[PDB]
Amino acid sequence: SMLAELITSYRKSAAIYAFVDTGLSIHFRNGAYVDIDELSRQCGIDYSRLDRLCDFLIEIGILVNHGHKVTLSEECSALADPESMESLIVKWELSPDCWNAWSMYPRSLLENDGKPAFEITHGKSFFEHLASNKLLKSNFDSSMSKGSDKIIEKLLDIYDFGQYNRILDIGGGEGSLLVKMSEKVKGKHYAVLDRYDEIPVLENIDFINGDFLKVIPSGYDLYILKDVIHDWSDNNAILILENCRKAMDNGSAVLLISYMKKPQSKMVIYLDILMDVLFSGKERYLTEFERLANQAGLVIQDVKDIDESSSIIQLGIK
Amino acid sequence: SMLAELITSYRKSAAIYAFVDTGLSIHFRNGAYVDIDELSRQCGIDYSRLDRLCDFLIEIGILVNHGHKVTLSEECSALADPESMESLIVKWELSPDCWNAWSMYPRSLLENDGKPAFEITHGKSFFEHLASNKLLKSNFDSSMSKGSDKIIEKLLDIYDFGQYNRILDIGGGEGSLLVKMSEKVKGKHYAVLDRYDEIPVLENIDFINGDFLKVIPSGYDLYILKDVIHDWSDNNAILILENCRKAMDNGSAVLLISYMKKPQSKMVIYLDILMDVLFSGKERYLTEFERLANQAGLVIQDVKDIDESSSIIQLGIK
Ligand SMILES: Nc1ncnc2c1ncn2[C@@H]1O[C@H](CSCC[C@H](N)C(=O)O)[C@@H](O)[C@H]1O
Ligand SMILES: Nc1ncnc2c1ncn2[C@@H]1O[C@H](CSCC[C@H](N)C(=O)O)[C@@H](O)[C@H]1O
CATH class of the missing domain: 1.10.10.10 (Winged helix-like DNA-binding domain superfamily/Winged helix DNA-binding domain)
Known part of the structure; x- marks a missing residue:
């Protein structure tokens, strides 16, 4: 049946x-x-x-x-x-640490606290847990880097990154998006902000041990948030976009690269349940993104569709 | 994709x-x-x-x-x-204790020690764990009864239980099979053997506390093994069927009520992997059942199909 x-x-x-x-x-x-x-x-x-x-x-x-x-x-x-996006996703998503969290999803729905199923299980947030388990972090980070490789050609085709001199990738992880961006778009200052215990070194890309919840570094033409906003609640999403605005000078841009919630967007609905269980995040409609941006003191200037289920959102001040 | x-x-x-x-x-x-x-x-x-x-x-x-x-x-x-077979199955099969066991399936395959993923998780067998968890046992037990209720009619249509005066249900649990059999087939000596902390009392039905790996009580015309053999390794299954033979006298019969493995049979292949993970058991072909029978000093007398994926197998001493 x-x-x-x-x-x-x-x-x-x-x-x-x-x-x-x-x-x-x-x-x-x-x-x-x-x-x-x-x-x-x-x-x-x-x-x-x-x-x-x-x-x-x-x-x-x-x-x-x-x-x-x-x-x-x-x-x-x-x-x-074993280095394919799918193989690496399988090794972190279906590993005991992530698999076993789904057991506590019903409890998380009833608790009416802030704690996701993953937090009830491990007594830590997902990213806090990754800091203590290197192999799980390596498979996660690698899968994300493999994910960036699949869409970078389309991104470079639909958007003009060459118009920006200084580009920061907020929660850029390994910095794979900018490594690949460098191969076509040359002569730019590329930085990546993320939580590093050991700061990674590549030459052509700079790396900053930062916390985008407290402060984002100023003096960049473009600020990129790819698959970051969907990890967070509305208040923490506003807090990141607020910190983006505080570091921004007029003429500078924020680019959101995100999955977009639509009526009967199958893949995004599937993803949305995982975001609740693992990150306590959520997938959002364009209308919801605009209000988060507006609340943070930012305005949407343009939207361009990568996929039927993902888009880029250019933000500015005013 | x-x-x-x-x-x-x-x-x-x-x-x-x-x-x-x-x-x-x-x-x-x-x-x-x-x-x-x-x-x-x-x-x-x-x-x-x-x-x-x-x-x-x-x-x-x-x-x-x-x-x-x-x-x-x-x-x-x-x-x-909440008392539908599907609702009851959901409440034990997809519960934390069973769900989390599937995490250890890869480890269970590589270890090759005969330990199922469930044993590696909880440190004891599914049935040992049931004796320590009353809610998981209650949901499992109820789902087993709904299983007996759904097929008892088809059982009575294809098999003459009336010919047998003394009937023993080996691993009969709640005794749901013999209770329903009592309503259509009356004036018989009905008994159930299983592991009971407290022995169930229906007065007319005899409930025996025993271990079918050690000995089975003698002086019964029919010995029923319903959804028991598929819980066990080939060697433990032979031991059970040996204990049946040793308890039997000529003219008495063993009835195996079991799922049957056929080429490409979807549902049983699905079940076969759960039997590995939870019970360290398996689903078998008729030829496999015949080897177990032969090894136990027994012979197949008749095979009758309940449906596509289920059969009853009459065994006799020879
Ligand atoms: N407070 C924080 N400060 C900085 N980086 C953070 C952070 N919390 C999470 N991150 C990082 O945010 C990233 C979210 S996952 C997405 C990474 C990347 N944009 C991609 O497209 O794959 C991870 O690298 C995570 O470690
Ligand atoms: N060593 C052992 N001795 C006796 N009963 C045992 C046993 N190991 C397992 N069992 C019992 O075997 C049964 C297998 S589950 C099947 C239950 C019942 N025949 C039905 O189909 O509805 C359980 O009730 C379990 O308690």
């Missing part, structure tokens, strides 16, 4: 985490025809239990049965590459 | 648990048209966060939006009844 399939949906995700995390997936790269007996003795997993996992992976369409050989479906080929 | 949907599948399951566990589902009984603002007050969830959950429930097809009100779709109507 439809109800039975929705109830058991989680098993498909759990099996994919197993397929990637155990190291099974890497044996399926380049559409290789894999023998499960060889796979069992290579990866050191009991043949019977691996053969049973493979039957489930075949059933849900991850693997394809060729008779006496199994292959990774072309649609799911990214799982074979 | 197909890969992205498979990765995020778990969120659909988590949202359904939230819908039932928080008590929201009870407001949608009898195709009731629910105001989300009214629902948010009555259940004590923040309106904004409940509205976001309902948007996700609409997307995945659980809820149906009519103008300003929502109803539970006729396909997912079982969620509104």
Whole structure:
């Protein structure tokens, strides 16, 4: 039934985490025809239990049965590459720390405090937890960097970044967006603000150990907030945009690169539940973004659609 | 994309648990048209966060939006009844204790020590854990009874239970199967063997405290194993069927009431992975059941299909 399939949906995700995390997936790269007996003795997993996992992976369409050989479906080929966005997302999103948080989602809905499901579980915010668990932070940061690679060409096609001399990436993490921006747009001062215990060093990009909740550094032509605002409540979102305005001089711009809530925007609705559970954030309509900006003393000057589910918002003062 | 949907599948399951566990589902009984603002007050969830959950429930097809009100779709109507098999399954299967176990599935595959992911999580077996958790046990036990209620009719149609004077249900739990069998088949000596802290009393039904891994009581015409064998390794299953043989005298029979593995059989493949994670069990082919029977000193006398994924298997000593 439809109800039975929705109830058991989680098993498909759990099996994919197993397929990637155990190291099974890497044996399926380049559409290789894999023998499960060889796979069992290579990866050191009991043949019977691996053969049973493979039957489930075949059933849900991850693997394809060729008779006496199994292959990774072309649609799911990214799982074979451990550095792929999808593989890295699987390794942090479906890891115990994030997976187990969903257990406390019902409690978080009833508590009527400020604490998300992830905070109830770990007694820490998501980013506070990442500071104490390097491997989880590495997989998160890397997946985000891989995410930036997918949209950078479109961004550079739809928006003129070359008109700005000094560009700061607020919560830019590894600084992947600006590293890739540098390859086309040359001769600019590029900085990235984020919470670093060890400050990363690249030459062509500067890095600042900062806190955008308290203060944002002044003297930049462009301030970028990519997938930052959706991590935060309305008051903290205003606090970041406020701190942006306080550091701004007229002629300077803020660019928001964000997922956009629309009526029946499937991918964004799916994402919105994760943002509640993991970050206590939310996906927002353009109308909501405008009010957050207006409250912070900023005005929307232009909106351009990257995707059917994401946009860039240019902000100024007045 | 197909890969992205498979990765995020778990969120659909988590949202359904939230819908039932928080008590929201009870407001949608009898195709009731629910105001989300009214629902948010009555259940004590923040309106904004409940509205976001309902948007996700609409997307995945659980809820149906009519103008300003929502109803539970006729396909997912079982969620509104807290004693529906689907509601009871949701309340044990997607509960923290079972949900969190799936995190340790990759570790359980690599360790190769015979420990299921559930045992690595809680430090004891599912059934050992049930004896220590009354709410999880109550929901599990009730869901098992609803399982017996749904198929008892088909059981009595395809099998002559009337021919047997003394009937024992090995691992019969609540005794729901024999209680329903009593209503149609009367004047028989009905007994149930399981692990009881306190022995259930229906006076007419005999409830025995025992261990089917140690010994099974003799002097019964029928020994029933319903959803027991699939909980166990091949060796523990042989031990159970050995203890049956040793208790039996010629003319007595063992009836296995069990899910059956067939090539491409979707539902059983799904269940097979849960049996690994929670019980360190498995779903088996008829040929696998025959080897276990042969190893135990027993023979298959008859096989009768309940439905597509379920069968009853008569065993005899030979
Ligand atoms: N108070 C704070 N000050 C600075 N950076 C912060 C912060 N809280 C969170 N961050 C950083 O904000 C980022 C949010 S994730 C998004 C990163 C990047 N814009 C991208 O497109 O992937 C993370 O790097 C996180 O560590
Ligand atoms: N060692 C053991 N000795 C006796 N009963 C056991 C056991 N290990 C597990 N069981 C019981 O085996 C049952 C398996 S679940 C199936 C319950 C019932 N036959 C039904 O289908 O509705 C549980 O009730 C559990 O308590």
